[PDB]
């Protein structure tokens, strides 16, 4: 028998008879008695712990009360409905402490086994939460561990947790894209609505790709989080100096070649001085055609008297690529 | 043992044997006996309290009965299903009272820790309720504490509660916008429907932004609540003296420049004397172009024989900006 | 101990051992024994009551059996699942009665505190039920108490119940409008679907407005119930003698002025003798323009060769207002 | 103690110790012992009944087993979850019987009080079930009691049950229309979707109207069930001898008069001999205009060069009424 | 007491103390002891049965374990939650057996009473499952008993089970059509979405019709299952030798006559040799017009300068019927 | 009595008194005592096993803790709610082991009976999970057993499990297609939305076809998984050397013949050197027409003054087939 006092902000459903202290779900201690000091929420709770953990008890040890969490976000009261309320613990590398302060929520528990722990950078969290799932070829091979705002107030750092046997998958050249929420995909001549699976809608998801020839990533490497599969396309950035962005769309104006889609306009900017400039991603198979004296001009959706097509007039402006020869250059000027 | 009589309007599921008085979830008192006086809902309930709280018992002390609230709005009967019905208390700074009147609902409990407590002003409550969530970069960093109608009958004051470690986020120049409910976003050439996350739909939400260079806000500062992210855009108000608001829309008529969207018409008014005047927000990057002899004229969605575009004819009237030089002025007259 | 016989139409889950009589949730009586007379549903139930209520027992006292109501409409069996079935009572101003007849449902219980109790008149109930909520600035400040058909078979009288601290809100010039159900709001150039909050969809709601300068209403005053916020607009009725209601819509044909919407056609009638007459609500700011020699003529959505607008041709007929001078008149004739 | 044997097809959850026989929810008998005869589902169940019901036991007495009915259609196991399984009884006007056969379902129980019991005739049941609700001004004033196929195999007879205090409402000239299911109401220039309340969607509903001057209906009077509110319109049938039903719709082709809708084409037939004839309901206010030498001719949605209207060209064929004088006739010939 | 060993593949929640053997829900036997032989899933379960069933025990007797089936498809653990797990039995016409093998699922139980048991032939099962419902005039008068693939691998045989009192309904000339799932019904000038009731959506349904003059069907007669009400129309097949199926639709191209719809093209084929032939169902009222020298020619949706109709140009090709005289023939050639 | 120590990562709801070891649901062992070694999650759990399994205990024996899995994915805690938590086992072909390591999840249990076990190759998993269903003629005849990524990082191997009596169905020439998720099917002249049954939406499904004349498949044969029924069409691949892929769609551009649809363009490629080539599946009935001097030319949706069709102008480019004679060739060049 030992004596440990823990300060609680609020203690609900705790009886001095049967309120065990469960470390990893095994009873390690027992609540002795609950008292309050000077009526200022100073819930002094005496806890007798088995002697083996008393030797392993240190200062960096955190306690928390588990309640049946049936709230707006919560399922985690399965043990708490059966056995009742209890408290838990996590031993740490502290020196020594008798008087503890209980943590308001259950903290995140690192596991001992070798698991890949990598960070992501996103402009915002999106529809992701802790406990959401990580897919590869739509196979769950991990989950989102935690999330934290970087000290620069712009971004959000998300760190995820790959399983042990799938650490070979995450390469240095892997890209992570977001899959969360749902929309409607209406095109011309009929609409069909598919975005994601039903597991991703409620809590969020992150898919990723593994390139073929790359070194395996490790040890808290950062990655960018793209907001769509379409934004996660590989390719070569080509800067364009546009005349005027009249009918151009930020992510929907394509680059035709022989009638087929090759590139996609991705960014559209208004530089100071009145210079509308943008940039474009292309298929890497067509980069060999991108050389010197290579022209990019825009075609209008004109009303042709011989070929009356309804589909082209809905699309609008359309970038056309004609090939060239010479040194490969990476920027062009549209007249 | 002590004697405290509490008037209840209705007392349900209370037994004189086991009906504890739980202050913050720990048993402090016990219901002795329940009687009714002169058959006019005067439910005299005798309560014996432990002697330590009897010294701390004062006049401004409120009692309330907790029931399993499984009603139209309610989940909060989790403790009440397990243990049963009980009553609670909140001690206050009163002098002395023996005969109490029970409060009809559980009141709002201020916490002792340092948490930011700021007020919002809204024209109506919207789809917000107490217990709805507050996002920053879509990360929950607080919740709506309470709401109250100001003595002027026009507005609604909402006061929220930021967490302790996120008090650095709320600056003096922060803007709060509403995210609640859902709609459909139909544009031309296809429609895609995304408004908000699934947590915000049921109970409501409030997001906010943190500007980069501002003093940190504190101590019950007021803020305006914008009704949309689009209404929360920063910019410079530019007053326009319009000829006639024929095809103009209150929040959908844009300000083109080199084909790109710069401004957005925000307010449209009918002044007495037959003068249609409005005002416009602009991008702060383009304010340097707003000077003297700077003209704003409206372009019609005309049917051009060479460039037949379907997208422009659906939009309607369109404000065009041409730059000027001289002193920066903040108002213009459209002819 | 006393003896009270109560006739039940059907008595379910009642044991002679433990079936208490709960007045306001406190045990006042106990079911002694259940017998049936001559096999014609004459369920004679003997009830022993405490002596204090026996003095307060009178003739206008109603009893009812509470069952876990988990039916198509019901949540109200929360006490009945825990404790079991019981019966309740409401004492009244009767003389004396021993043999009672049990009421088939739980009756409506007036509270003792000062609460505003006002009547509404509606052409039908709509999607309102008892227990639906009453909003002011979308804040719940009351609920629908009861509803009853007036002896004239045309209308429905609904009486609601404002809270105690919000009796200042309801003025004499307040208007009550209905918010219940959901629809889709499709306009031209895209559609967005928002009608109401999620609490109003299931059970119904009623919002209201408080004008600024009015006497506070009291004591069972009547009010009209408008079926929409749009039908609850203030304004001045202007009678129109229309030539022929060809493309006119009952609530969608607007009154333009300088391109802006001022009025809205509200009623459209076919008088005998072949005279299509209607009436219109206007903005109260524009009533000063409504005088003698003030003309209202309708504009067609004509195909203009210079200004080709798609939005006007979808709208149809359009009332135009030109101002006049002289004595203010309240009716006009459209040629 | 008595002995009654009841044949069950299947007896589930019945213990010889505690399986009461509940007439109207009060224990009247007890299952003695369960045996099966010659392994052919002859579940002989001995039941001891109290002596008072033994005198009232007769031959036309039906027994049924109640189970927690949590199936595809069922909520009615609320008593059966708490107390357990039991059986019930309904005494009748038989002579004498000892060996009974249990009914496979719980039969319909007529109540003793004066309630109106009227029959409806419908071409099919629709989305109505027993236990669905009956509205008047959208107030529940009854429910569907039963339904049965008439011996002619064409129709379905539905008999409903009005409450006691609302028997004044049902008149001889009342019309009953169906409200069940949901659809979408898409018109031109925008669509809004409202059909019914949320209670009617799951189980069905029937609304009705009470005319002003009519005798009160009584005593199993029949009524027609219209399939819509629109089909329940009063009016005068006018037979039309149409030239050819080219663009005519069965329930959507209106009868204009001064641009306003007066009538509605309701039935459209192909008589033998190649004679397309139909019939029309009209507003009763306009029947005074229907006389001799009264012409009905159809107007085409023609493209007018001066009044270019998009709304008329979507509607199609349109019946026009011009008034006449003379004797009132009830049929016309369209040329 | 007796001894019966039953092989189980997996035995869950079975205690040697209280695991009864319930034939039709009455306790007939008790599990004595559970042992496993040579660790190869040979779960030897000893069962002591009452002596009366031991005489009736035969070789063709099947046993099965019932578990609370709360899985993807299942509600049937209502008895299993209350009493616990048990096993059941069905005696058969075998000789004698002591060592049994337990069936993996609960088999289908034929009832003793006279019920109609007829087979259906369908090209696939569709959205039907066992336990789905059978409607007549949308009244449930039976249910789907079982389903089995015929030895020819093309079809699916479904056998259903009509109630006892409705055996008069099923005639020899009855047609069975499928009602399962839901779609959207979009027509021109507005769309309204109604397919089926809410009970049919989850599990499936089958409706049927009873013709007036036909012999009553009996004794495992086969029937075709049509996939829609529209495919279940009666009529006369008329073969057509079409010139080229250019704008013709398989089930949507109608047969006009005097502007009214008479027939409906149902099948469209490409015979070898380049001969597009189809066949058509007609109204049986119009078969008298189908004779010799009767012409069927197709009308184009032409743009008429006098009658500009939007509805006809959306429909497309349209078959026209002109009558003829002479001998009735059943095939035609379209030029 | 025996002693077996098992390492757990976390042990939840385990009591040393009553925590049985259930092999296939029969109690085989009992948890003796729980200790932790040196505070590094070394949850040493002593287990006493019956002596018969102790002889059958070997080294390749896996243990796992079962918890009520009410998580994001979970129903499998039905036994665990009733009895409580327990652990299970699977004996294997090991030599001998005393100190075990508990498996983190319940492993997959191969059954002893003859069931077909075949592998599928898919480019990604799709919306399939383990426990999803396998249909034949929409009859459930198996389920997905497991899934695993092949060592080449491109694909995903899925192995399924056909029932015992349906092993005749799976032939060598069978094709497996995916049915999972839902979309919208909007076509011209109205839209109707049906994709799949209700079971497949939540968890996924896989349907298949059995051809008529093929050898029965067996013993871990591979199969391709097509992503749609339309992609699972049989036919003959015809390579096309297209001029320019201008209005051509990857899976929506058809091959007309006499107005009827015969083929469907399936793949469209941009070869290096600027050669847009594609390939097409055809009906096997038309392969006899595919010979030498057989021409495939594309028809435009031209505006014809005599036949004004709305349907053809929405479809776009359209491949036309004219037959030829000679040797059968399998590729063509479109000019």
UniProtKB/Swiss-Prot annotation, chains A, B, C, D, E, F:
**Phenotype for residue 314 to N:** Well folded and assembled into a hexameric structure, but loses its function
Q: Where is this region: MCE/MlaD 2?
A: 115-227
Q: What is the effect of changing residue 198 to N?
A: Well folded and assembled into a hexameric structure, but loses its function
Q: What happens when the gene is disrupted?
A: The letAB mutant is not sensitive to lauryl sulfobetaine (LSB), but the pqiAB-letAB double mutant is more sensitive to LSB than the pqiAB mutant. Double mutation also increases sensitivity of the pqiAB mutant to caprylyl sulfobetaine.
UniProt-annotated stretches for the region MCE/MlaD 1: 1-104
Upregulation details from the record are: Induced by a defect in lipopolysaccharide molecules.
Result of altering residue 82 to N:
Loss of activity
What effect is documented for mutating residue 81 to N?
Answer: Loss of activity
Q: Where is this region: MCE/MlaD 3?
A: 234-335
Its subcellular locations are: Cell inner membrane
Describe the task this protein carries out. Answer: Forms a tunnel that spans the entire periplasmic space. Is probably involved in the transport of lipids between the inner membrane and the outer membrane through the tunnel. Forms a dynamic tunnel sufficiently long to mediate lipid transport directly between the two membranes without the need for a shuttle protein. Binds phospholipids. Lipids bind inside the tunnel. Required for outer membrane homeostasis. Contributes to membrane integrity.
Per UniProt, subunit arrangement is: Homohexamer. May interact with LetA in the inner membrane. May also interact with partners in the outer membrane.
Q: Which family does it belong to?
A: Belongs to the PqiB family.
Description of its domains: The seven MCE (Mammalian Cell Entry) domains of a single protomer of LetB resemble seven beads on a string. Six copies of this linearly configured protomer associate laterally to form a homohexameric assembly. The LetB hexamers form an elongated tube consisting of seven stacked MCE rings, each formed from the association of six identical MCE domains, with a central tunnel. Rings 1, 5, 6 and 7 are dynamic and adopt open and closed states.
Q: What is this protein called?
A: Lipophilic envelope-spanning tunnel protein B
* Record organism: Escherichia coli (strain K12)
Residues represented out of the complete protein:
46 to 380 of 877
């Amino acid at each position: 028998g030992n004596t440990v006092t823990i300060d609680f902000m609020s203690a609900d459903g705790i009886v001095p008879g049967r309120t065990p202290v469960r470390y990893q779900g095994v009873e390690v201690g027992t609540v002795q008695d609950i008292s309050l000091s000077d009526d200022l929420r100073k819930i002094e709770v005496k806890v007798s712990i088995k002697s083996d953990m008393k030797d392993a008890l240190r200062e960096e040890t955190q306690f928390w009360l588990v309640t049946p969490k049936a709230s707006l976000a919560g399922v985690s009261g399965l043990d708490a409905l059966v056995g009742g309320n209890y408290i838990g613990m996590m031993p740490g590398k502290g020196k020594e402490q008798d008087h503890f302060v209980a943590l308001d929520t259950q903290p995140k528990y690192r596991l001992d086994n070798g698991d890949l722990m990598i960070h992501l950078q996103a402009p915002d969290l999106g529809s992701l939460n802790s406990g959401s799932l990580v897919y590869f070829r739509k196979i769950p091979v991990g989950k989102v561990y935690d999330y934290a705002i970087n000290p620069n107030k712009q971004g959000v750092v998300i760190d995820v947790l790959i399983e042990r046997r799938f650490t070979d998958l995450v390469k240095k050249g892997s890209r992570f894209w977001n899959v969360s929420g749902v929309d409607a995909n209406v095109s011309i001549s009929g609409a069909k609505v598919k975005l994601e699976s039903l597991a991703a809608l409620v809590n969020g998801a992150i898919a990723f790709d593994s390139p073929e020839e790359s070194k395996p990533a490790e040890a808290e490497d950062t990655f960018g989080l793209y907001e769509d599969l379409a934004h996660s396309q590989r390719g070569v950035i080509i800067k364009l100096e546009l005349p005027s962005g009249a009918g151009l769309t930020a992510d929907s104006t394509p680059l035709m070649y022989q009638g087929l889609e090759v590139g996609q306009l991705t960014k559209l900017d208004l530089n100071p001085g009145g210079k509308v400039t943008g940039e474009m991603t292309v298929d890497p198979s067509v980069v060999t055609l991108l050389r010197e004296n290579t022209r990019i001009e825009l075609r209008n959706p004109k009303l042709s008297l011989s070929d009356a097509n309804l589909s082209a007039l809905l699309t609008g402006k359309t970038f056309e690529l004609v090939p060239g020869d010479g040194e490969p250059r990476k920027e062009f000027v549209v007249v």
